[PDB]
Write a protein that binds this ligand. Structure first.
Ligand code: ACP
Ligand code: MG
Lengths: 272, 114
């Protein structure tokens, strides 16, 4: 058993770039547009399972196509009539690089200058998404990629405004959940501000603001426990930078940065 | 632990006899309520739903509230994110006064008379 060589007469599949939960991403050639693309597909071993097909079909139908330099573009979606059944696929902008999750794990904590530039570019992507009526809801280091040319690329934006059902963002490690998401309170753009603050905290210190043995313990910490200032967790971090991270990580959304664009302006001021 | 969403892991007055009430406990729709007075009451994001629950995580056809043997019960009709009763994932569950029903990000409290 194997993966098809082509998804329609247009996409010639190459090497596997990585794996998700139920998916695999292949480097592919767009034979029509004459370009390299990344094709996210349901894993070949799960393709014959009707439950995974139904879950991945929704994901392909909900993949948002946003055109911005700091957002992984979605060029096409479809379903290949594979000899092993229907195979849904998402055609994306190929990113030759690694996730922020990979960098924190292998390289460790980033320098203050680079970490600021990464998060400032991520703010631009979130601002554009919010201007298109889309709250990301799942901002985490794994959803931010850094290219070979050091370009920041945010991925996994959903179609937001018969509408297709979305999965619960609450499932996972809970380390990047906002207090309102963990509680089931109203969610607005300031939730992405909070989650990006968690990412900014991790790239600066080498660890997320809250850690625990269970997702309940981490969610509890997000809601009630105050985060330790980044300078106290990692050396060489200014009080001005500490004020930015801790403002984004405020419990009440009212005390956070009200917009992603506002968070970017304060980061650029610290960058000077 | 009850303060968070389920994924993280005798009765009331003023209700007509044989009927129940579902009240949204928190969020944008906090305070909104739905009276259960039929044998079958559908709940979902589909516009024709008896209990319309507009949330991205709620399925168009999510659940049904059934009045069987003078008592109420919730049944999941095949949703994506499931139905929870008192934080526990269920296919079908009998409802008692004070029970909490989670459909998507909605935290509904089930209320009935004595
Ligand atoms: N456009 C792209 N270009 C290059 N590599 C990409 C890519 N999209 C994804 N990848 C690679 O594939 C891996 C898995 O992708 P991703 O995290 O989006 O999957 P997923 O949506 O199935 C995870 P989840 O199940 O948690 O939602 C990434 O860690 C990365 O290495
Ligand atoms: Mg995904």
């Amino acid at each position: 058993m194997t993966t098809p060589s082509h998804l329609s007469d247009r996409y010639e599949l190459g090497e596997i770039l990585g794996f998700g939960g139920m998916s695999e991403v292949h480097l592919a050639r767009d034979l029509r547009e004459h370009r390299d693309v990344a094709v996210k597909v349901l894993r070949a071993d799960l393709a014959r399972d009707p439950s995974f097909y139904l879950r991945f079909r929704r994901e392909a139908q909900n993949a948002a196509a946003l055109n911005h330099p700091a957002i992984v573009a979605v060029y096409d979606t479809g379903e290949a009539e594979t000899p092993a059944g229907p195979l849904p696929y998402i055609v994306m902008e190929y990113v030759d690089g690694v996730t922020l999750r990979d960098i924190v794990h292998t390289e460790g904590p980033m320098t203050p200058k680079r970490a600021i530039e990464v998060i400032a570019d991520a703010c631009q992507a979130l601002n554009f998404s919010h201007q298109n009526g889309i709250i990301h809801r799942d901002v985490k280091p794994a959803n931010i990629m850094i290219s070979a040319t050091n370009a920041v690329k945010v991925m996994d934006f959903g179609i937001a405004r018969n509408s297709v059902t979305q999965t619960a963002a609450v499932i996972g490690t809970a380390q990047y959940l906002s207090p309102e998401q963990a509680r089931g309170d109203s969610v607005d753009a300031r939730s992405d501000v909070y989650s990006l603050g968690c990412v900014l905290y991790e790239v600066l210190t080498g660890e997320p603001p809250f850690t625990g043995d269970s997702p309940v313990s981490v969610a509890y910490q997000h809601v009630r426990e105050d985060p330790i200032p980044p300078s106290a967790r990692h050396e060489g971090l200014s009080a001005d930078l500490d004020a930015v991270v801790l403002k984004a990580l405020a419990k009440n959304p009212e005390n956070r940065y009200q917009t992603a664009a506002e968070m970017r302006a304060d980061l650029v001021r610290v960058h000077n | 632990r009850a303060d968070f969403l389920s994924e993280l892991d005798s009765g009331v007055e003023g209700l007509p006899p044989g009927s129940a009430l579902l009240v949204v406990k928190r969020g944008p729709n906090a305070g909104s309520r739905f009276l259960l007075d039929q044998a079958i009451t559908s709940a979902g994001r589909h516009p024709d739903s008896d209990i319309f629950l507009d949330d991205v995580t709620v399925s168009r056809r999510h659940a049904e509230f059934r009045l069987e043997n003078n008592e109420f019960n919730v049944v999941d009709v095949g949703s994506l994110n499931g139905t929870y009763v008192n934080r526990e994932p269920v296919d079908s569950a009998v409802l008692a006064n004070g029970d909490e029903v989670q459909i998507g990000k909605f935290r509904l409290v089930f209320l009935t008379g004595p």
